[PDB]
């Protein structure tokens, strides 16, 4: 009966002051799966073309959104600007100044929480990001496609842009959206997939008609559905909580991630976007690559509300000389050394408010979180050269803790010894803020948080994880 | 110290228009003054500019349509930070 | 797939 895109968003146990808006083609605003919902607002900036063809982009995922029969969040209201034309090409001017229409429009008349829908792609750009960054900063939320290309989200825009949800596509099977050498972009400046292939949506055919689309911009749109909703019952949400929640929410490791190219598995999240049925978050953030340099370096940052819990680091060399958390503009940020090709940073950033959180520089039978009433989130370490719950264990080495301050939260460690592969999880319930490796036998690769799992690779080996939760 | 950027990928350069970004704290009426000044010192090499749009609210700056030959003279007008080439954008 | 963003897909 249901369409399948919106029963796989659908949580396995499950129960409008937001407005949304779209950057498009032109609109068939009386579609009745749209009508009386989407405010056409007459903006347009689009190059010229070298009828129904001329909506069809735009009028469907205008139902994806919103519609009556086929959205996800139905009844959400919506309000369109036209920057493609009807080719659906437009252009990074174009696009800059219908986004500086919305900021003008909410300066002129605020409304609540608003969430603006970018179902489009274009290179990287400097400027069409910088200006969703000041846009996100301001407080709007922005959702964009990753792109279509089987390509590094990275290297489009706005999919690359700092503080915006980046989506990508997956299809019935949980894998994947590919089309020969088309297919959904990936890596790590995709924040999640959604469905989006075979995504059935009003068809601006006629005012009843239906239609299957697929496309990123498929799967964007069900994030800004779930986006809206997840404002409208806490429209007090900032970015970095509402992308936590999505990350929280998301299916986990359904994604059969042979289909991405092997440098991008670690890179690109395993997550596929669910509503919220009817606390401690925590993320994993990828740097860029460092190069290879013997110094160097890597750098993970987290958002301005959010906490640096902990720091890893990975080369698939083997060849690192660790990592460290160290301040940076009054910011813990996670700082990842070359031996060796090159590192990452792999950083945990985190949502724990009434918390205040510090780094402790020591060598690796003591305490490195001394305080009273402090528990230790991660345990980094680093070394110069090239070969008991609150306390961080090592060889030579210098080790970097990170204490915090709370009262309301309990973590305990879990360490997993045995090998190119070993994890150890979290329990249910308990949210992954640290994972590092022990050295033995094997030659440590690195180690990294998947969702509340340790992951360590090698070439013993034990895996440490350390787990809280708010009690 | 103001630099020039066009998008990597040549199918989708639209050369002819530019986005001239100015430094953050650039007030709408010097983005305005700086437009014009560009338009003077093109005018007296024999070049015709067209502004196409004054950006304020998120990013100051503007939109010229103009020959790339101006660059290296638009780059050294005052408060402005990088210029780029305008490119191309798809639906998804 | 449709070309407005033409093959079966699913
Ligand atoms: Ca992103």
Redesign the interface.
Same mark, same amino acid.
């Given at each position: 009966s249901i369409p399948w895109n919106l029963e796989r968003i659908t949580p396995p146990r499950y129960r409008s002051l937001v407005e949304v808006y779209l950057l498009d083609?032109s609109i068939q605003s009386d579609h009745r799966e749209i009508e009386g919902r989407v405010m056409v607002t007459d903006f347009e900036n689009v190059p010229e073309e070298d009828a129904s063809?001329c909506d069809?982009?735009g009028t469907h995922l205008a139902g994806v959104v919103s519609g009556r029969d086929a959205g996800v969040a139905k009844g959400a209201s919506m309000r369109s600007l036209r920057v493609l034309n009807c080719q !659906?090409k437009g252009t990074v001017s174009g696009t800059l100044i219908g986004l500086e229409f919305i900021r003008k429009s909410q300066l002129v008349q605020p409304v609540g929480p608003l969430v603006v829908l970018l179902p489009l792609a274009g290179g990287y750009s400097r400027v069409l990001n910088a200006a969703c960054q000041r846009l996100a900063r301001a407080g709007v939320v922005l959702v964009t496609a990753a792109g @279509?290309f089987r390509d590094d989200a990275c290297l489009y825009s706005p999919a690359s842009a700092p503080e915006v949800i980046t989506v990508g596509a997956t @299809?019935?099977q949980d894998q994947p959206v590919t089309?020969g050498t088309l297919g959904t972009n990936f890596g790590r400046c995709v924040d999640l997939f959604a469905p989006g292939?075979?995504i059935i949506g009003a068809s601006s055919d006629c005012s009843t008609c239906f239609?299957?689309?697929? !496309?990123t911009?498929q799967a964007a749109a069900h994030v800004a559905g779930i986006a809206a909703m997840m404002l409208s019952a806490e429209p007090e949400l900032t970015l970095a909580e509402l992308r936590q929640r999505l990350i929280h929410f998301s299916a986990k490791d359904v994604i059969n991630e042979a289909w991405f190219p092997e440098d991008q598995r670690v890179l690109t999240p395993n997550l596929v976007a669910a509503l919220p049925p009817s606390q401690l978050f925590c993320r994993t953030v990828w740097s860029a690559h460092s190069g290879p340099t013997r110094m160097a370096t890597a750098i993970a940052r987290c958002a301005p509300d959010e906490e640096l819990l902990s720091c890893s680091s990975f080369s698939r060399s083997g060849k690192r000389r660790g990592e460290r958390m160290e301040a940076q503009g009054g910011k813990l940020v996670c700082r990842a050394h070359n031996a060796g090709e090159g590192v990452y940073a792999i950083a945990r950033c985190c949502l724990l408010p009434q918390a205040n959180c510090s780094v402790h520089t020591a060598p690796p039978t003591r305490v490195h979180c001394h305080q009273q009433g402090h528990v230790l989130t991660g345990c980094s370490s680093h070394w110069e050269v090239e070969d008991q719950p609150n306390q961080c264990v090592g060889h030579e080495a210098s080790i970097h803790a990170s204490c915090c301050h709370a009262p309301g939260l309990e973590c305990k460690v879990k360490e997993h010894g045995i090998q190119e592969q070993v994890t150890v999880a979290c329990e249910e319930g308990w949210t992954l803020t640290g994972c590092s490796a022990l050295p033995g036998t094997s030659h440590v690769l690195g180690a990294y948080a998947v969702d509340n799992t340790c992951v360590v690779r090698s070439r013993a080996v034990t895996a440490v994880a350390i787990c809280c939760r708010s009690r | 110290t103001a630099t020039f950027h066009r998008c990597a990928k040549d199918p989708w350069r639209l050369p002819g228009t530019y986005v001239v970004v100015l430094k953050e704290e650039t007030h709408l009426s010097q983005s305005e003054r700086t437009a014009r000044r560009l338009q003077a010192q093109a005018a007296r090499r024999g070049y015709l500019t067209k502004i196409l749009h004054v950006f304020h609210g998120l990013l100051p700056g503007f939109l010229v349509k103009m020959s790339g030959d101006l660059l290296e003279l638009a780059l050294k007008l005052p408060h402005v930070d990088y210029i780029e080439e305008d490119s191309s954008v798809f639906?998804? | 797939?449709?070309p407005?963003?033409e093959?079966p897909?699913x």
């Open positions: 083609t063809k069809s982009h !659906g @279509n @299809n019935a089309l292939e075979d239609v299957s689309q697929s !496309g911009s | 639906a998804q | 797939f449709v407005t963003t093959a897909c």
